[PDB]
């Protein structure tokens, strides 16, 4: 059980991260106009709210820990549950770590005016250091998590307050909503994906649904309030960015938040805001490392991965399964060496939203195959909100496939590599 306000804070903390500080580059480089990027943010938030409600329904139906793995295992089959676990193990969490390490290195270089050639070495060093820190037990990781969660709200609030009162802010800063050079149809998909990365992490509402005290009255209010607060914060931050900088200026830099802070609080305030952004990125990497470490243990304890004994090995000193962390760190380093922030974020969004759309279809199927299950929480408008979430997910998947064949091919190839691993592991019993 958890208090209603406590769940609100949990949702706001998990969803909000370092995407808002860096994704505006992609959003306003694709959209190309101040108004279309804001529309992308709003649409992404609406889709996130609908998906959160839909996922929370099944989370209440199946309160067992694990999340999408458990949901898809129970609805479709064990093979798809393992497929979700494997995709999270080899794409989602490694790519999140790689992308956040790359952006941390980029922001660090910008802050300290170092050469751009040190971005990859930095990213690698910080990823290794954070993984090693997480290997020393949950104490330091929890301390970092709490500190980053507390501190990441300060730069956002400061930027919003300062930019909204910038000398020149006004409705004129949000025009013309479209530039002929960027067609609305093609560019809006890329803008939507870029915004959707900033909303990542909302899938934990389903996991928290089972823990919630009294779903069905607090769960809808909690989810709607938390995701609406996240959407409002993102919209206000983007409005502040547009007040301080133009759409072209935001698209022309890899650190929009740093540039806006430099314009707002010249002197030491810009440096402090940049350090806050770096701390937020650090906390994001740490949280992703923890959540990712939790996955290979779950897969191995069910004898679903090769050398499941090795993966499920528990460290006597810290009582942590380290080997899965090492595998994820290796994959993340490989991604860092041969990847980019925007590309990795797009891949993450593509794979996670494919599986999330599968989860929505699972909710719809459960509403039909097993109408008699005890449902503590029912989605508000069954024929409308799940349909909106599924339409959003399908649009994301198809737009990414059409616009980024290489990224979609990479994700599909990794998952299809996972499949024969599943069959071999079933044959050999771990």
């Amino acid at each position, epitope marked *: 059980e958890v208090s209603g306000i406590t769940a609100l804070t949990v949702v706001v903390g998990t969803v909000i991260g370092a995407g808002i500080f860096f994704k505006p580059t992609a959003v306003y480089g694709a959209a190309g106009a101040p108004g279309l990027g804001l529309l992308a943010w709003f649409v992404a938030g609406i889709i996130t709210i609908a998906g959160g409600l839909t996922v929370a329904e099944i989370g209440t139906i199946y309160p067992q820990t694990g999340g999408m793995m458990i949901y898809l295992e129970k609805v479709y089959g064990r093979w798809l549950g393992f497929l979700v676990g494997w995709a999270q193990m080899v794409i989602y969490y490694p790519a999140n770590i790689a992308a956040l390490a790359i952006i941390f290195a980029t922001q660090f270089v910008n802050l300290f005016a170092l050469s751009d050639s040190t971005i990859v070495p930095t990213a690698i060093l910080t990823s290794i250091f954070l993984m090693g820190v997480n290997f020393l*037990g*949950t104490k330091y990781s929890g301390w970092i998590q709490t500190l980053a969660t507390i501190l990441k709200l300060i730069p956002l609030v400061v930027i919003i307050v300062a930019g909204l009162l910038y000398p020149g802010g006004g409705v004129i800063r949000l025009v013309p909503f479209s530039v002929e050079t960027h067609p609305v149809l093609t560019s809006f998909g890329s803008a939507l994906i870029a915004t959707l990365f900033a909303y990542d992490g909302w899938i934990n509402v389903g996991t928290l649904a089972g823990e919630m005290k009294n779903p069905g009255k607090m769960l809808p209010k909690v989810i709607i309030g938390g995701l609406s607060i996240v959407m409002a914060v993102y919209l206000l931050t983007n409005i502040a960015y547009l007040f301080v900088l133009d759409s072209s200026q935001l698209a022309g830099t890899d650190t929009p938040a740093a540039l806006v802070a430099s314009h707002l609080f010249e002197g030491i305030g810009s440096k402090l805001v940049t350090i806050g952004i770096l701390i937020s990125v650090f906390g994001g990497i740490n949280g992703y490392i*923890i959540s990712g470490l*939790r996955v290979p*243990y779950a897969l191995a304890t069910q004898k679903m991965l090769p050398f499941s*004994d090795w993966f499920a*090995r*528990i*460290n*006597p*000193k*810290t*009582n*942590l*399964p380290i080997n899965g962390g090492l595998v994820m760190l290796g994959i993340a380093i490989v991604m860092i060496l041969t990847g980019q922030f925007n590309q990795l974020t797009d891949l993450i969004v593509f794979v996670i939203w494919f599986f999330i759309t599968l989860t929505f279809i699972a909710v719809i199927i459960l509403r039909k195959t097993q109408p008699d299950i005890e449902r503590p929480y029912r989605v508000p408008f069954y024929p409308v909100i799940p349909l909106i979430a599924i339409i959003g997910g399908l649009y994301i998947i198809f737009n990414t496939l059409i616009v980024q064949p290489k990224n979609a091919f990479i994700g599909i190839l990794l998952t299809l590599i996972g499949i024969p691993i599943y069959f071999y592991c079933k044959k050999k019993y771990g």
Partner: nanobody, 116 residues
Framework: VQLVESGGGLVQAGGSLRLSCAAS????????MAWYRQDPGKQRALVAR???????YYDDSVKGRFTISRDNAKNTVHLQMNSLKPEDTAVYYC???????????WGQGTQVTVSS
């Protein structure tokens, strides 16, 4: 989920006590059983842990003297505190945790003190 300890008590320095800890209601074979130390007005500090696969970890201050052993047949864990020393006096708890992020199961806690 109970964890009943025993074996602690007053002992002369340099003695040897074994702290049995019978665990019931948990998947003992799958759990990593540990022994913690909580000095007065402090927080529990790990003394020794043994994983489900037999791998063991010992605190630097007890390494070479303490020996943690588990026997899944009777669902008990022992801690042979050989060559006790006066600073070793504290209250020793019996823990049973599946994984670092799982729920921690604690015993009633046993008091062991070294007279000399």
């Amino acid at each position: 989920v109970q964890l009943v300890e025993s074996g602690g008590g007053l002992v002369q320095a340099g003695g040897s006590l074994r702290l049995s800890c019978a665990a019931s209601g948990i998947a003992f074979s799958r759990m990593s059983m540990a022994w913690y130390r909580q000095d007065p007005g402090k927080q529990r500090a790990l003394v020794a842990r043994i994983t489900n696969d037999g791998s063991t970890y010992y605190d630097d201050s007890v390494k070479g003297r303490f020996t943690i052993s588990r026997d899944n047949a009777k669902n008990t864990v022992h801690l042979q505190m050989n060559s006790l020393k006066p600073e070793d006096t504290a209250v020793y708890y019996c823990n049973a945790q599946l994984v670092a992020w799982s729920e921690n199961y604690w015993g009633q806690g046993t008091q062991v003190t070294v007279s000399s």
